[PDB]
Write a protein that binds this ligand. Structure first.
Ligand SMILES: Nc1nc2c(ncn2[C@H]2CC[C@@H](COP(=O)(O)OP(=O)(O)OP(=O)(O)O)O2)c(=O)[nH]1
Ligand SMILES: [Mg+2]
Ligand SMILES: [Mg+2]
Ligand SMILES: [Zn+2]
Length: 572
DNA sequence: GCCGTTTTCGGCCCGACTGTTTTCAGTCG
């Protein structure tokens, strides 16, 4: 991938232009193209390999954001970006990333106190300079200090799974606040986006001041950036930004739509409303002053001539077009999943025994659970050897016969060597119920080699699932360089399923690689990669990722019952 | 700079919070 650089490059063209006072809509052309490319997990040049007049087609991208890309790879750099660089100091971009700052304030600060970096800004307030500026007051200076200090505690975006459980605690607390008729977790959290920038809570209330004052009073709250009658922005005792939005109960449905987004999806709907002479806000759909919809989401979407769109689809990735023409995808649902196909145990890196896993699986209402432990490669040991994997399969057999349902499947997560060979001999793989293969080494391999390595792993006829394929770690490590079309092509042809690993720091396949695979007709496997019984609660996230990728119950191994899973497995 | 089951040109989402703004601009979701 190289989206991460080019996402920053347009983001910079937009910001430098925004500083120079450019056409705001041209500015927004870049900002959007920045957001979609960074969110794009399928490598861009793999899509750009066919660009040309078909680059005029991509997503949120037109002809002008193409000849610049024609230029980009032809010459390594876009003149527009370089032209803007000469007019706008590199450090002013950093200053206007500070929440509350923006173009006009960054410019005033530059021409006023010559501030052109965070380091300089930091010095300016500590010294107390901005409280002297002509127009920039002492109150407006405290505003900057807030935003400057509050940008730091909230470091990176956080994986959804890292904050999920906390989010539900806060939700249950907000539902118990006086004045709160009804509350819900919206924003990116509700769309199951693999990472979040904050947590966005909507509240139905008729005494909104009470609820906001009640919300900020929660013990996890550390600071308050902004606080009004209807909304508040706060940061927790751990850095995580949390926003509250209050709306009257009559507009609850329009409030859910508003706070759930995405921005881009929301803008499609409002733009649509304009075509039909209507207005869409948080308060409802309106024809003139007459509110035609608001109480619920269903009827709000109906007001725009649309069926209800599930939150995970709301990324303006074709869900609106598919809603107009009445062909929304049928989506997987959590109760349809009848087991977890990658959990670990005390046999290797897990914290749990078979009894502990079985008990956890039964409690959740699972039909089965695959106990897949690491191959020797994880440590490179010689005893634990391949010999005693048979006794492990034997021990799990007797466990099933004595306990009954749910059933433990004897599995294994087998390392893929740098050449594509597997960490376990074939006779060991032959007698395993579930065989997962995955990469835990040599990530910097060139695209072509990493493809060959993966392809040879798929030629092994005992392989059932290709586990967390990209090998990424959210915040720690990028995806491996690989031609994923060829890899999914091969896996399909060999009947191997691709894994959506719901473990909080993996979330791999990502939504849009998952949507690609499933679109090609591949089978899918869902797991949590659990090392403690807590982790089994991540199935929700793999499902949500499945949902984001327009994936239904068809060709998903977890929706099969115990018997049908074994058939599928026993028939290689 | 994108973009068209009412458009290939003329628009481009809508409203809350903050500050020194006496009538609204800046920045944000
Ligand atoms: N109409 C409209 N809605 C917006 C705009 N910006 C944000 N929203 C809505 C959509 C989602 C909701 C929360 O905004 P966030 O900034 O939290 O974005 P998010 O979608 O939750 O993602 P993130 O994980 O980055 O927070 O507010 C906008 O410019 N216009
Ligand atoms: Mg959010
Ligand atoms: Mg937010
Ligand atoms: Zn693994």
């Amino acid at each position: 991938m190289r989206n991460q650089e080019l996402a920053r490059i347009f983001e910079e063209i937009g910001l430098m232009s925004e500083f120079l006072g450019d056409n705001p809509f041209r500015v927004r052309a870049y900002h959007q193209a920045a957001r979609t490319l960074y969110d794009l997990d399928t490598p861009i040049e793999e899509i750009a390999e066919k660009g040309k007049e078909a680059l005029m087609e991509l997503p949120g991208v037109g002809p002008d954001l193409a000849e610049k890309i024609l230029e980009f790879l032809r010459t390594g750099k876009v003149r527009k970006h370089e032209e803007l660089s000469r007019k706008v100091p590199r450090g002013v971009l950093e200053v206007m990333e500070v929440p509350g700052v923006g173009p006009k304030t960054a410019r005033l600060l530059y021409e006023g106190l010559g501030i052109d970096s965070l380091e300089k800004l930091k010095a300016a307030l500590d010294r107390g300079d901005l409280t002297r500026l002509k127009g920039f007051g002492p109150k407006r200076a405290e505003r900057i200090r807030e935003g400057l200090a509050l940008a730091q505690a909230a470091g990176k975006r956080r994986p959804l799974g890292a904050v999920l459980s906390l989010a539900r605690s806060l939700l249950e607390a907000i539902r118990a606040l006086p004045g709160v008729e009804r509350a819900e977790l919206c924003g990116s959290a509700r769309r199951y986006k693999d990472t979040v920038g904050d947590l966005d809570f909507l509240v139905a209330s008729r005494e909104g001041e009470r609820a906001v004052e009640g919300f900020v009073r929660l013990p996890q709250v550390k600071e308050v950036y902004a606080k009004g009658k209807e909304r508040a922005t706060v940061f927790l005792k751990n850095g995580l930004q949390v926003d509250l939005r209050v709306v009257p109960p009559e507009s609850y449905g329009a409030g859910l739509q508003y706070l759930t987004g995405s921005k881009a999806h929301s803008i499609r709907l409002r733009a649509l409303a304009q075509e039909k002479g209507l207005k869409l806000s948080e308060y409802g759909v309106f024809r003139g002053e007459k509110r035609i919809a608001g109480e619920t989401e269903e009827e709000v979407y109906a007001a725009l001539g649309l069926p209800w769109i599930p939150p995970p689809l709301r990324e303006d990735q074709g869900e609106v077009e598919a809603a107009l023409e009445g062909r929304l995808p049928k989506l997987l649902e959590l109760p349809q999943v009848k087991g977890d196909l990658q959990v670990h145990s005390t046999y290797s890196d897990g914290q749990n025994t078979l009894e502990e896993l079985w008990e956890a699986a039964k409690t959740m209402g699972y039909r089965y659970l695959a106990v897949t432990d690491h191959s020797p490669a994880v440590r490179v040991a010689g005893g634990p050897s391949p010999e005693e994997a048979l006794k492990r399969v034997g021990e799990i057999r007797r466990f099933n016969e004595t306990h009954g349902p749910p059933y433990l499947l004897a599995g294994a997560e087998v390392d893929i060597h740098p050449d594509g060979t597997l960490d376990y001999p074939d006779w060991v793989l032959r007698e395993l119920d579930l065989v997962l293969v995955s990469v835990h080494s040599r990530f910097n391999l060139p695209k072509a080699d990493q493809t060959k390595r993966l392809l040879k792993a798929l030629e092994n006829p005992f392989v059932h699932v290709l586990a967390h394929p990209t090998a990424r770690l959210l915040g720690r490590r990028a995806p491996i360089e690989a031609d994923w079309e060829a890899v999914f092509q091969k896996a399909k042809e060999k009947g191997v399923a691709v894994e959506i690993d719901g473990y909080y720091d993996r979330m791999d396949l990502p939504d849009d690689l998952a949507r690609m695979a499933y679109g090609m007709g591949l089978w899918i496997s869902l797991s949590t990669d659990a090392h403690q019984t807590d982790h089994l609660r991540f199935m929700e996230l793999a499902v949500g990722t499945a949902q984001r990728a327009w994936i239904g119950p068809e060709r998903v191994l977890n929706t099969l019952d115990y018997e049908d899973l074994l058939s599928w497995l026993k028939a290689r």
